[PDB]
Design a protein around this ligand. Structure first.
Ligand SMILES: O=C(O)[C@H]1O[C@H](OP(=O)(O)OP(=O)(O)OC[C@H]2O[C@@H](n3ccc(=O)[nH]c3=O)[C@H](O)[C@@H]2O)[C@H](O)[C@@H](O)[C@@H]1O
Ligand SMILES: O=C(O)[C@H]1O[C@H](OP(=O)(O)OP(=O)(O)OC[C@H]2O[C@@H](n3ccc(=O)[nH]c3=O)[C@H](O)[C@@H]2O)[C@H](O)[C@@H](O)[C@@H]1O
Ligand SMILES: [Mn+2]
Ligand SMILES: [Mn+2]
Lengths: 602, 602
């Protein structure tokens, strides 16, 4: 009843990571038995998938990872032309990689979707007889009908059933190696990668292959002409999207399905105790539900499913080791800023987007449909899926900061447009002020405007002229000047060299710091006191606040978010935010003692 | 295998409508057999549920409605104090209301959630023996332990299994009527409404009751103390939320589940042909997928699940029959306007919100947590659930217009704040201009501002002064003046009486019209040409555009929506919008002929 079903998936890259996320969602939507995933992945995919499954907390799912690079030398001698690359040749060597104590496994591809319970496919293992060990579905295309030799139409490696014990007893490694060498002696190339090799083995030993029903692998490829195979669309099971209305709706069902709905244990089967799940349960049990601020404390320890590098990412290390990454976080309603930011900052960017699955797909379509975003590869998109009622601003900031590729980071905001050439200016400033060997934070002055149509200045003199004419203002000039009052804009107007300032109450500048800067406090959600706590923690750790003369950023106006609108620092939210501020002050007093006394009167 | 399962639900009110939506979602998430819902509902709930199920298009679900008011006289003689009111006493008379050809039924309450397949509960009907006909779960509270007499702890009417044929053969009506009369001779009142009466029958004839397992009705009431009943939380089936962490997560699973995922047919069972579903399938099949504008044409005919009156609504007819309803539509990112609008317009408001299920719950929490929104009952919230990629602005406008309660409607916008007292001014203007007997549209001048902090003028003179100082501008003054150019603001500055204007190219004012105004064209989605087509249709039907002297509205600035940002009338969206404009012009030429020739050069 609770028999563990083992699924082996080969993943490599960010696109493959998204595809395997979709496949795992499809499998979990129909599962009824414990699942053990064996992910053969390179480091790029391994980090993403490990973080995703750690934060996902799916009950009765055990995930293990295997170094795909170590297997490259196993297939480095086989030329390949399939778009999956060398990683497509690794499904042959799974018997060498998977643990020796495993008997049966279901090998899948990243472009597979499940419309039925995977236990039904696992039950097919009971029907194997004789020496049949590879459960394969006959190819639905005329590719092998005349390519690599195959039996009949050939078999498709999109879904495979393997009996590892029998393959190991029969020395599958030597068999497939000899078959591949013999085929490559004349073919000299592979058209469909290891799949072709599979067919070659099927030619030599047809008795090893068990022909599964066609509806276990519905290949929607070009010129498929398989209408008879899926004539009964109601009873279709597994779909393969190998293409370079019901199917579209089914795909969109899982592509936009909420993954947090999968955090429910399997009935009748014990769930293994995970450290993160146990910690979350203990912390939530410690919280008092009678307290009026229960929601905020619950959101503080809430673990959000995080998908690092949601889009393709590339980066090259800086030769001078002084590179700076723009760090910001945003929700969906701020997407219009992104392109503008990409037009101002030419350096690496690390963003944390708080999107739902539907919003994640909308953002993916927007990014793939935008020339500006597709022309830039050094922008890191880390999607933190929505959960709870409040906006985890500090959690998003921590996610963005932790996954940068540069020694220094600028803790900017998505609503702020920087000046042109600020990237090179900060790269020079870190060398000039020697931030590597000192605890110094370089403050970038913040300005705000109320006009959407703005002629962005190309120099500091033009910015001063615009300030004189009343078009621009210092940030929060009309509401709360205490935030940037210690910036000393009056001295900044005529300053030609960076100058040090001192911390004051409610100070919250925008700082360029090192990679190892202390993290934000996750206890603050929504709007208010988010950056004040971080600036206080910076000051208590002996950080020197330095204002640069020739740097500035302008806060473009934005409609109030639902966070502000609902919890506009009034009534229950104001009381809870004051309580959180008091708790943070108490923790500051306890942790550092004498060095943190001056913040009590702040 | 495909046996039809009949579920009887009593619904009354908007809160009950939301609850029954949640219950239906919970039932459909676990169903495996055809479902036939019998909804005993009053007109208020009947309209909402009929529209919701018509737009929902759930396969293998047959919904029928029964007049609950006609049954009131059947229980008008029984005093009741339960918060469900007289509608709570109707479950007794279901045998009188349901069709005589039905044998077995499952009676549910609006506060029920299903965590297991309802076919499992329907299979319990096979286990009935003897004269046991009411499948009930013993009450889990000490309410009946000492109230109305009961057997043991009593039985809970949250979930009932009825054999209608046997009840009719045994004359259940007379039995329960006599039992209720005898009990009320001494009790004189009902504490738990018909439930108490049920228990009384259980006292007289205990052999009629079949005691279901406890986990078929898990009552989470106050002082429940039933930990033993749900000690195995993994294998819990039906939850009753009769209260005035796993349970919370389970409730939020269905409260925020996407209902459009339920539009999948049951495997192995034929689906009945519905007129709306057939029309949608035919229209989508007619559309060419090779056309680059496939998405827009698909969205044109897409049927969106509509939930009329998502919150409690009250209204009183105007004595003079000249009342005007502010009609507007908005998405989530415009919620901050609502309260402001409620501070300006004291009359009835009809709004159409394009929210997802999670966004619907967020809006419900915001509205229940806001004093301004809870103090106003004449605001109609019609939620149109998200589907597709584009914003159905015209569909939302049609939904808002069609469900107003007043003879006249103002086709305003959510981004526009009206002047104080505009409600009474328009109520006087409709009488002054005699819009009842003439085809006249009263134009309200539109202005825009770029400053979020605005001192709203209390008179026209102050508005003129603000215009002179450059603080305010006419709407789209800096971008596209053609939209409100025919408004003739120069004449409006000194005008003291309403004056007629003439239609011009791309004219798009904001008009007060009658209830029977022609609807918007649903072929336009996103942003662009949405109101131009409606104004052209108004002009081609001989509507006189009248500008009022002492009326104005100010367009508060807003961050660009994702619709503008992505499809900012550029590239593919611009081409598709131009194509839609051309098609609308062709339809205008064909439908009216000579009277529509002047729009070709527009
Ligand atoms: O730096 C500051 O001075 C202030 O910045 C924000 O306050 P504010 O800008 O008024 O409010 P938002 O516009 O909601 O916050 C801006 C930042 O939050 C993000 N954001 C986006 C969308 C959303 O709904 N909520 C939200 O907080 C934006 O992407 C951006 O990074 C913080 O919430 C304050 O705690 C802080 O004092
Ligand atoms: O009112 C008008 O005359 C014009 O409104 C919009 O032009 P614009 O104001 O630039 O764009 P929006 O800000 O999208 O229009 C305001 C309306 O759009 C609604 N809205 C809200 C949110 C959203 O995502 N999309 C959207 O269209 C708002 O609720 C409000 O009713 C349309 O693009 C024009 O076709 C229409 O004629
Ligand atoms: Mn901001
Ligand atoms: Mn607008």
């Amino acid at each position: 009843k609770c028999e563990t079903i083992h699924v082996a998936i080969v993943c490599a890259g960010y696109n493959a990571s998204r595809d395997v996320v979709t496949l795992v969602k499809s499998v979990l939507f129909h599962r009824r038995n414990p699942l053990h995933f064996h992910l053969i992945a390179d480091s790029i995919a391994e980090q993403i998938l490990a973080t995703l499954f750690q934060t996902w907390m799916v009950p009765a799912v055990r995930v293990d990872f295997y170094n795909a690079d170590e297997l490259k030398s196993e297939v480095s001698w086989i030329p390949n032309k399939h778009y999956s690359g060398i990683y497509g040749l690794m499904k042959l060597v799974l018997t060498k990689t998977l643990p020796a104590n495993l008997e049966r496994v279901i090998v899948l591809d990243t472009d597979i979707t499940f419309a039925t319970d995977i236990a039904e496919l696992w039950a097919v293992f009971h029907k194997f007889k004789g020496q049949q060990v590879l459960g394969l579905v006959e190819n639905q295309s005329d590719w092998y009908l005349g390519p690599w030799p195959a039996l009949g139409r050939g078999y498709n490696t999109g879904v495979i059933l393997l009996l590892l014990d029998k393959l190991r007893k029969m020395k599958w490694e030597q068999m497939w190696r000899l078959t591949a060498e013999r085929e490559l002696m004349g073919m000299l190339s592979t058209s469909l990668a290891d799949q072709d090799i599979f067919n070659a083995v099927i030619k030599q030993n047809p008795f090893l292959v068990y022909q599964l029903p066609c509806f276990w692998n519905v290949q929607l490829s070009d010129h498929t002409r398989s209408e008879q195979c899926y004539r009964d669309v109601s009873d279709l099971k597994v779909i393969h999207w190998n293409s370079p209305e019901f199917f579209r709706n089914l795909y969109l069902t899982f592509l936009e399905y909420d993954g947090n709905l999968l955090r429910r244990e399997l009935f009748g089967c014990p769930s293994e105790a995970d450290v993160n799940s146990e910690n979350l349960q203990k912390q939530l049990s410690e919280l008092d539900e009678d307290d009026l601020c229960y929601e905020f404390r619950r959101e503080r320890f809430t673990v959000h499913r995080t998908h690092l590098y949601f889009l393709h990412y590339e980066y090259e290390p800086a030769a001078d080791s002084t590179d700076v990454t723009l760090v910001a976080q945003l929700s969906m309603d701020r997407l219009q800023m992104l392109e503008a930011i990409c037009k101002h900052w030419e350096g690496p960017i690390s963003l944390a987007l708080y999107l739902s699955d539907a919003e994640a797909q909308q953002f993916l379509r927007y990014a793939q449909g935008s020339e500006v975003l597709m022309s830039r590869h050094n922008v890191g998109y880390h999607i933190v899926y929505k959960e709870g009622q409040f906006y985890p601003v500090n959690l998003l900031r921590n996610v963005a900061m932790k996954h940068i590729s540069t020694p220094y980071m600028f803790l900017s905001d998505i609503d702020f447009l920087p000046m042109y050439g600020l990237y090179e200016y900060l790269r020079k400033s870190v060398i000039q002020l020697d931030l590597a060997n000192t605890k110094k934070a370089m403050i970038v002055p913040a300005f705000e405007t109320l006009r959407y149509r703005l002629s962005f200045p190309k120099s500091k003199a033009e910015l001063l002229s615009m300030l004189d004419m009343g078009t621009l203002f210092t940030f929060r000039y009309h509401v709360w000047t205490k935030g940037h009052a210690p910036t000393n804009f009056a001295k900044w107007r005529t300053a030609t060299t960076p100058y040090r300032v001192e911390w004051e109450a409610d100070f919250e500048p925008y700082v360029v710091v090192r990679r190892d800067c202390p993290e934000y406090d996750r206890r603050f959600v929504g709007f208010g006191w988010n950056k004040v706590a971080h600036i206080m923690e910076l000051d208590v750790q002996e950080y020197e606040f330095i204002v640069l003369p020739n740097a500035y950023m302008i806060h473009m106006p934005h409609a109030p978010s639902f966070d502000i609108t609902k919890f506009r620092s009034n009534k229950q939210y104001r009381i809870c935010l004051k309580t959180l501020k008091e708790e943070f002050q108490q923790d500051m007093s306890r942790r550092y003692g004498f060095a943190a006394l001056k913040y009590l009167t702040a």
